[PDB]
Nucleic acid binder design. Structure first.
Ligand SMILES: [Mg+2]
Ligand SMILES: [Mg+2]
Ligand SMILES: [Mg+2]
Ligand SMILES: [Mg+2]
Ligand code: NA
Lengths: 48, 142, 153, 178
RNA sequence: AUCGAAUCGCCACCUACAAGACUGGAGCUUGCUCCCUCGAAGGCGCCAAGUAUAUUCAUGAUCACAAGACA
RNA sequence: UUAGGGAUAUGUGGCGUCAAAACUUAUGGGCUCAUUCUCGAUACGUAAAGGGUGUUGGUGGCCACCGGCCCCGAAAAUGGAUGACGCUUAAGGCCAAUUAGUGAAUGCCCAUUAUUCCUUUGGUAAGGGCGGAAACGGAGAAAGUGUAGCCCUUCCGAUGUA
RNA sequence: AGCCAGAACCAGCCCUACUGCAUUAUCCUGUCGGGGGUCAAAAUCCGGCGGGCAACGAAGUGCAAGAGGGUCUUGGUGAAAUGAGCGGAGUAUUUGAGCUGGCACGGGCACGCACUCUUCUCCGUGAUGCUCCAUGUUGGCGA
């Protein structure tokens, strides 16, 4: 395997023409750690 | 025409003033607003709710974080909003911006009411957009 | 009962570029293939269709095999099978599907409010009739408990 | 869908020489996937019947013969094929189709299935449409009956590619996954 | 009490059962005709408890885990 | 057929799961049912005569012969192998396609290969600059095999036991 | 301007857009006769002669010339931008298609060789710079 490229399967997208619509869109993987560390707007918005 | 001239733009034709847009990101994600104009030097768009309907004030926004639908409202408001209105010096609203908001929103509401299908357009502006289970946004017209 | 494959039978195309169009069988080649044409449609000139791609309908215009276009046009017109097909609910469902496929955000909003209005009025009517004849779980339980409450409490 | 073989006419001759200042011109009909294969078959026929090699020959013309209008007809196909054990064998078979190229493509697939015969081991002697009263096989004759009608049973119907699902509710059409 | 965390549709209308050579009901011409539920949708949910000139939203300042939360 | 790395496209081989690819493609055609090693299914590589109304077709005169798949013929030593599971409107065997009688060259996946971009190193390597122009953003500027390479630009090769 | 983001523009590269000419005849079409079959007549099929382009997607025949999307696959924000793309000047220039007046080509010319529609044209910045490096916009974080 080559780990620099990942493969993603999206609900209700079952066709190559469908998948072309998403070329260029942004993608996110959300998880959690063990401690609280720095984030965006750590000072402006302490609620985050 | 000249690229250095502030009048020079490259905005896609869908994002034209009076078009009704869906917010895709930020604090007001999912709301529908009305595109007022584009700032000079190929800058951001400026949109307003109006704030009575959905609570969206006058605000700058990148055209890449918007879906410009084909539904339009004819606008002929004063549109005296320059770059200086959104620049600040190095529940609380200044008494100038607070007045500008009213001056624009009254005219915008008059335009929507004067339009045919005014009631339907007002409800459309009040509604909220979301992605439901089973939805396929890549197959839709807008 | 079932609709046999025969000359003059009306069919609907299932898949492919001609999906959801109606034609008339003018000839049978073998167990797999037929010749189909519909003069009153733009893309339905005389062509070959595999029998796995068709849906036989309930109408048969009475014509002989390998008939002329002139003899099939008037036979269709006299049979009035197209005006009959346009009144079924499967035809209306096909037209609704096309209309839904070609639709704007404004029209989707309109449909949403129409369905919400229908649901609100339906639940109102149901509440009014359940007041007379108790059919909800809470009304059944209320009527079951009323007799007990009449005693003691 | 469409037949995989086209119909070609190839016209050729041997190059003139002091021995043969005016050679004979020959015409050839072949069914082939492209004109290069068609020319190969032509030169093989010339080599084995007229003792003319491709290295001393000219090809005057090479075209594709158009099909007629699509009409359901009976086609008689006279064909031959080779195998090591039996040798060379000649068959005459009737087919139902809408064009000459369609009938010949049918014949090639049929030979591949029932005798394991490949393209380059097959020669087509003739193919023509015959009337309804010369059909000998009843399995072909059954399609002339003017009252022919039958139902479609045991159908394997698939949904449109955009609407296919993996898991669906048992008595409904709702998709749960995909 | 540590504990901040990933997950982002709900239902006391789906949450009963069988068939796919065959399947709403009649005929007799058994593959056509006629009747009408027209034989290709679980119900809701997506911002006024409902289709109607009602109503606070900003300064969280142009993206950032939804700064929200289990309808 | 091989310098250290990206992108694009291919070869052999594949596209039910293991395992990337037809989320089990087609709006392609035939054929096949096999009950204790057992239908069959990637070459090189580890079963014959003779029989069979099992089924599908062909030649000549309801017959005689020749084919295709399948079945008998077919008997060893620990429990075990189409690689495993399984598959029979195949996920088998022969042929043929590329989204399908619509109307126009390439369905998809995978290399230390091919094209291209960046950097290194070495050449039977190929060019240019090196009398400080003047003034006063920054510094430098060596007539040179080999360096922290005098400085730029360019092209081609790069694996390896004794 | 240190770190981390987003958007815009320029050069390059890579993808998808936008496409005409030849060839059709074993073909298309109308009659006449045959042959066929039905409850009667049509068709599949064959031979006479009358016309011809199957021409909205008619061939799946041969050869083809016609700016939107990426670049966390590159470099940059004008510190010499060579541009049909940046600038100055006008409105014409000359490419094809139709239609026009010696030799070639075949037994007349389908239009080879020589002398109306359809498009944008001409001009410009050397290095007294041998080499290297220093130049945008909007937020987050860092007082
Ligand atoms: Mg969060
Ligand atoms: Mg896979
Ligand atoms: Mg070097
Ligand atoms: Mg070495
Ligand atoms: Na294997």
């Amino acid at each position: 395997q080559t780990k620099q490229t990942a493969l993603v399967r999206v609900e209700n997208v079952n066709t190559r023409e469908d998948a072309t619509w998403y070329v260029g869109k942004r993608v996110c993987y959300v998880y959690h750690g063990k401690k609280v560390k720095r984030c965006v707007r750590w000072s402006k918005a302490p609620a985050r | 025409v000249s690229r250095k001239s502030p009048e020079y733009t490259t905005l896609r034709k869908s994002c034209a003033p009076g078009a009704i847009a869906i917010i895709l990101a930020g604090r007001f994600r999912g709301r529908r607003a009305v595109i007022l104009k584009q700032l000079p030097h190929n800058g951001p768009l400026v949109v307003s709710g109006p704030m009575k309907y959905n609570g969206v004030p006058i605000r700058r926004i990148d055209s890449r974080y918007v879906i410009a639908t084909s539904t339009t409202v004819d606008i002929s408001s004063v549109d005296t909003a320059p770059i200086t209105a959104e620049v600040f010096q190095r529940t609380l609203v200044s008494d100038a911006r607070a007045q500008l908001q009213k001056k624009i929103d009254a005219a915008l509401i008059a335009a929507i009411k004067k339009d045919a299908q005014g009631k339907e357009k007002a409800g459309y502006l009040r509604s909220v957009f979301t992605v439901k289970p089973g939805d396929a946004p890549h197959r839709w017209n807008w | 009962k079932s609709h046999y494959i025969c000359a003059g039978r009306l069919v609907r195309i299932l898949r492919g570029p001609r999906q959801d169009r109606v034609g008339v069988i003018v000839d049978i080649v073998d167990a797999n293939r037929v010749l189909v044409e519909n003069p009153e449609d733009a893309k339905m000139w005389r062509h070959v269709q595999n029998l796995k791609n068709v849906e036989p309908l309930k109408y048969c215009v009475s014509v002989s095999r390998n008939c002329s276009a002139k003899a099939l046009k008037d036979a269709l017109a006299s049979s009035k099978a197209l005006e009959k097909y346009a009144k079924t609910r499967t035809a209306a469902r096909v037209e609704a599907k096309k209309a839904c496929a070609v639709s704007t955000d404004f029209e989707r909003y309109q449909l949403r409010v129409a369905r919400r209005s229908r649901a609100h009025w339906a639940r109102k009517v149901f509440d009014e009739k359940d007041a007379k004849t108790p059919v909800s779980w809470h009304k059944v339980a209320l009527k079951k408990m009323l007799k007990k409450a009449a005693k003691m409490d | 869908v469409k037949p995989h073989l086209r119909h070609y006419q190839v016209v050729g001759r041997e190059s003139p020489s002091e021995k043969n200042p005016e050679p004979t011109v020959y015409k050839f009909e072949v069914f082939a996937p492209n004109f290069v294969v068609a020319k190969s078959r032509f030169w093989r026929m010339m080599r084995v019947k007229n003792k003319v090699k491709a290295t001393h020959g000219d090809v005057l013309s090479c075209k594709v013969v158009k099909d007629a209008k699509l009409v359901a007809r009976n086609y008689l196909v006279d064909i031959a094929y080779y195998s090591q054990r039996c040798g060379y064998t000649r068959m005459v078979k009737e087919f139902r189709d809408v064009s000459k190229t369609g009938a010949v493509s049918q014949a090639y697939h049929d030979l591949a299935s029932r005798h394991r015969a490949r393209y380059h081991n097959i020669e087509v002697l003739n193919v023509k449409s015959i009337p309804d009263h010369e059909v000998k096989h009843l399995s072909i004759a059954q399609y002339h009956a003017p009252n022919l009608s039958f139902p479609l049973l045991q159908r394997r119907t698939k949904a449109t590619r955009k609407d296919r699902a993996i898991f669906v509710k048992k008595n409904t059409k709702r998709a749960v996954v995909a």
